[PDB]
Coordinates of C-alpha atoms and ligand atoms in Angstrom, one line a residue:
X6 CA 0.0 0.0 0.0
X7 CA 2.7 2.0 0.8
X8 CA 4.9 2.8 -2.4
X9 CA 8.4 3.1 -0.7
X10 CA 7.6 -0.3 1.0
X11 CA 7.6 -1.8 -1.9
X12 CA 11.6 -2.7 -1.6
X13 CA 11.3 -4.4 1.9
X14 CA 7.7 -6.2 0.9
X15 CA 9.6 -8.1 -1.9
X16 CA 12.1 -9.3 0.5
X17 CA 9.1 -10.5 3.2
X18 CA 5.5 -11.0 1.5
X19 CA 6.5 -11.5 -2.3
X20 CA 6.3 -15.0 -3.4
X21 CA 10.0 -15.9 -5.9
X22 CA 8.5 -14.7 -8.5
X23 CA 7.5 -11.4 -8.0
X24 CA 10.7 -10.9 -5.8
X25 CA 12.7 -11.7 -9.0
X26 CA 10.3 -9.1 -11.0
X27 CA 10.8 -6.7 -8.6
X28 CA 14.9 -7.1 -8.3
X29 CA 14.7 -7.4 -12.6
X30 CA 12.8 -4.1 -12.3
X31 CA 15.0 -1.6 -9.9
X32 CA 18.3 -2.9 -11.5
X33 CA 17.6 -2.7 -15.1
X34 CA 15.0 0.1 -15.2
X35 CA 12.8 -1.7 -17.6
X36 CA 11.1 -5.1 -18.0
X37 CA 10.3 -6.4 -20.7
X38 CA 6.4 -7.3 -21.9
X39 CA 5.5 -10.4 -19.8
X40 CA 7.2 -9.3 -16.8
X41 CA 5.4 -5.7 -16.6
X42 CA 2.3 -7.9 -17.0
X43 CA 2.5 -10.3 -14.4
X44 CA 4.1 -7.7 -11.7
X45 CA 1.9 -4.8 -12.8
X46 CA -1.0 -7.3 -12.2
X47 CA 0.2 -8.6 -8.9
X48 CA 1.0 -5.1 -8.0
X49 CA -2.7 -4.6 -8.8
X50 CA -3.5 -7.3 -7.0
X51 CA -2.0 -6.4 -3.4
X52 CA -3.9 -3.3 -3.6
X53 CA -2.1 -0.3 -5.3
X54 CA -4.0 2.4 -6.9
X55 CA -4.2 3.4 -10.6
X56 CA -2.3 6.8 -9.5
X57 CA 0.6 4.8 -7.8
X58 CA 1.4 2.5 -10.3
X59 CA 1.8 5.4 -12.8
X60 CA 3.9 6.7 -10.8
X61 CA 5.7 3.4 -9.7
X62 CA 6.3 2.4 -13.1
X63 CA 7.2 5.8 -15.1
X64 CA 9.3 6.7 -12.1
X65 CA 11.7 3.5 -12.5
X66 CA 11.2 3.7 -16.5
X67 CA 12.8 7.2 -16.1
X68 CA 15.3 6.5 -14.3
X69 CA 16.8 4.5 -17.5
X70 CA 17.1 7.8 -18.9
X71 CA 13.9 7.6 -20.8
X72 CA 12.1 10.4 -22.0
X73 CA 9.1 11.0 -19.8
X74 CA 6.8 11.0 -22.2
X75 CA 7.6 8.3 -24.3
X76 CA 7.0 6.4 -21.8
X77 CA 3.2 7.6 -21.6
X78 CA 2.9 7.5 -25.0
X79 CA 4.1 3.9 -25.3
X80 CA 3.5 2.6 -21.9
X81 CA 1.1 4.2 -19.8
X82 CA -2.3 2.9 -21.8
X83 CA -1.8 -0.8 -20.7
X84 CA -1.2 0.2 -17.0
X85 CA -4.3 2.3 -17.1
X86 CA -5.9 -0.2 -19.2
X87 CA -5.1 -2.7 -16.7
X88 CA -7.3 -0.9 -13.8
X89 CA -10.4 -1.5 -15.4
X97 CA -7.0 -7.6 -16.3
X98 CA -7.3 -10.6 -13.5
X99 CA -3.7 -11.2 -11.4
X100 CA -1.7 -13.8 -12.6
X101 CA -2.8 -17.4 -11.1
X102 CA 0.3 -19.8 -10.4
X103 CA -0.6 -22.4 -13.5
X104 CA -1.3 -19.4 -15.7
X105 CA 2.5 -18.2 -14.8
X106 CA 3.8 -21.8 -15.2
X107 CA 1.8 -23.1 -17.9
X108 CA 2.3 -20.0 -20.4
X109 CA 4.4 -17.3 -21.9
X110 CA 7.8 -19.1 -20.9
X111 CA 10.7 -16.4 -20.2
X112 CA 13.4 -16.0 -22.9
X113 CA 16.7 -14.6 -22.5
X114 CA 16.1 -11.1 -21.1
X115 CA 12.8 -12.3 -19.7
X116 CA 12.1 -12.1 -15.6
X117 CA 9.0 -13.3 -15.2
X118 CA 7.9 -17.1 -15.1
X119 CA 8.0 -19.4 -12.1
X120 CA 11.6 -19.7 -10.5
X121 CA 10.7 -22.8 -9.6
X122 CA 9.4 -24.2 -13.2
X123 CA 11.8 -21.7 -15.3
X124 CA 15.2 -21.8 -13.7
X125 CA 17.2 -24.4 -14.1
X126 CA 18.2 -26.3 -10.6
X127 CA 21.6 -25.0 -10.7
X128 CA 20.0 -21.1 -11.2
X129 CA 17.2 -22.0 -9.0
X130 CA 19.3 -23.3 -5.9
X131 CA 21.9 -20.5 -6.2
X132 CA 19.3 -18.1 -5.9
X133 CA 17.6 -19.2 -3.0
X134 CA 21.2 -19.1 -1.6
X135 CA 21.3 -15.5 -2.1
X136 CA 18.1 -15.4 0.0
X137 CA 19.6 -16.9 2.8
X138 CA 17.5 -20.4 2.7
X139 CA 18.6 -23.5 5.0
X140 CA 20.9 -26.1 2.9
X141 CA 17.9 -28.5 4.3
X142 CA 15.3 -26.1 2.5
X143 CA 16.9 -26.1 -0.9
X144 CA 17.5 -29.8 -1.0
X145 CA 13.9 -30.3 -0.4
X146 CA 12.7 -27.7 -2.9
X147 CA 15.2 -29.2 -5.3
X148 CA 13.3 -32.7 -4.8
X149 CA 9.9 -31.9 -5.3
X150 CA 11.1 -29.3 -8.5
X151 CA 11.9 -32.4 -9.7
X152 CA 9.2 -34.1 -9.1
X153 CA 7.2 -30.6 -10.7
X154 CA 5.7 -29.9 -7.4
X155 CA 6.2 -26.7 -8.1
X156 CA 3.7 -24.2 -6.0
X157 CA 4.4 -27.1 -2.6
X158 CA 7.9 -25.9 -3.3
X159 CA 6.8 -22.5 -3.2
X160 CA 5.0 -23.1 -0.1
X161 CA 8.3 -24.6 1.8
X162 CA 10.0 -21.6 1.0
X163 CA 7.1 -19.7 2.2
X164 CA 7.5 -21.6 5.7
X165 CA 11.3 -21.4 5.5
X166 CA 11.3 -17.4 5.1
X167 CA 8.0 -17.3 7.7
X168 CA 9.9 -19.7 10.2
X169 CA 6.5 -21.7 10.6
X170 CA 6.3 -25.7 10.2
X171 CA 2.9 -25.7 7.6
X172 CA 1.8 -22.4 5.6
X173 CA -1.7 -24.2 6.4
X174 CA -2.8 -23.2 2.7
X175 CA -2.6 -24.9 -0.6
X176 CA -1.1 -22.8 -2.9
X177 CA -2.3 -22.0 -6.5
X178 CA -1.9 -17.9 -6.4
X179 CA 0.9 -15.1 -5.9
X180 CA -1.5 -12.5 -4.3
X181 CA -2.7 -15.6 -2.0
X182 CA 1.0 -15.8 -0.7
X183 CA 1.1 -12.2 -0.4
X184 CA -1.9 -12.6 1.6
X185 CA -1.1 -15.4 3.7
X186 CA 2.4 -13.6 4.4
X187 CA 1.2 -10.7 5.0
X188 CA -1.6 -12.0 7.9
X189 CA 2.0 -13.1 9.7
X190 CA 4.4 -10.7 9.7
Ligands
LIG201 S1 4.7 -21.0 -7.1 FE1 3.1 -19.7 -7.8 S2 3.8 -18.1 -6.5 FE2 5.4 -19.5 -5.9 S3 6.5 -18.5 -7.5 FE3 5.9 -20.2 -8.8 S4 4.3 -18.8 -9.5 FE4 4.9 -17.3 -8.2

């Protein structure tokens, strides 16, 4: 709700994906087509206005030196446009539009390799116990039950009492804890 909260939120209530968007986001200044849609959505989705995400999303665009108002003649419609689509459901994000190179979005956990997928749950600080049990059922395409261990890993609870199947649903569910 809280536009400069937006930083610390991805670190405690986002699920990997949306973390990952997020990161994508502030570092490169730009995302590219699938990612604006499935954050912008979520963003949507955990409650931010039509006048923050304009400013959310022009104020990052801009800080990749880009022209103010190309960006409102070339990207503002589909974030207004998008207040009047339906947030991103876990098999929606899994089951289409698989990232490319250069693409952010996707499920971590369906779209990273192993190798990329345990490395970055290194860099958040996950238990060596954790990432060899996501690493088992990723293999096993248990994808959203390894989304909810990590969700009890970074919550420090023993069962996210929840079946998973929707990003704003973990936001939700983390959020109620924290
Ligand atoms: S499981 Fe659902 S929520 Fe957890 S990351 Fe993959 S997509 Fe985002």
């Amino acid at each position: 709700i809280s536009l400069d909260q937006i930083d610390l939120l991805s670190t405690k209530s986002f699920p990997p994906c949306m973390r990952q968007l997020h990161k994508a986001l502030r570092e490169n200044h730009h995302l590219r087509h699938g990612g604006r849609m499935q954050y912008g959505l979520f963003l949507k989705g955990i409650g931010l206005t039509l006048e923050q995400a304009l400013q959310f999303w022009k104020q990052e665009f801009i800080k990749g030196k880009m022209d103010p108002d190309k960006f409102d003649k070339g990207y503002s419609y589909n974030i207004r446009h998008s207040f009047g689509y339906t947030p991103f459901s876990c098999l929606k994000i899994i089951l289409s539009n698989p990232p490319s190179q250069g693409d952010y979005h996707g499920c971590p956990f369906r779209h990273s390799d192993p190798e990329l997928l345990k490395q970055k749950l290194q860099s958040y600080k996950i238990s060596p116990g954790g990432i060899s049990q996501i690493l088992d059922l990723v293999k096993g395409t248990h994808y959203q039950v390894a989304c909810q261990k990590y969700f009890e890993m970074i919550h420090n609870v023993d069962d996210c009492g929840f079946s998973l199947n929707h990003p704003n649903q973990f936001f939700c569910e983390s959020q109620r804890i924290l």
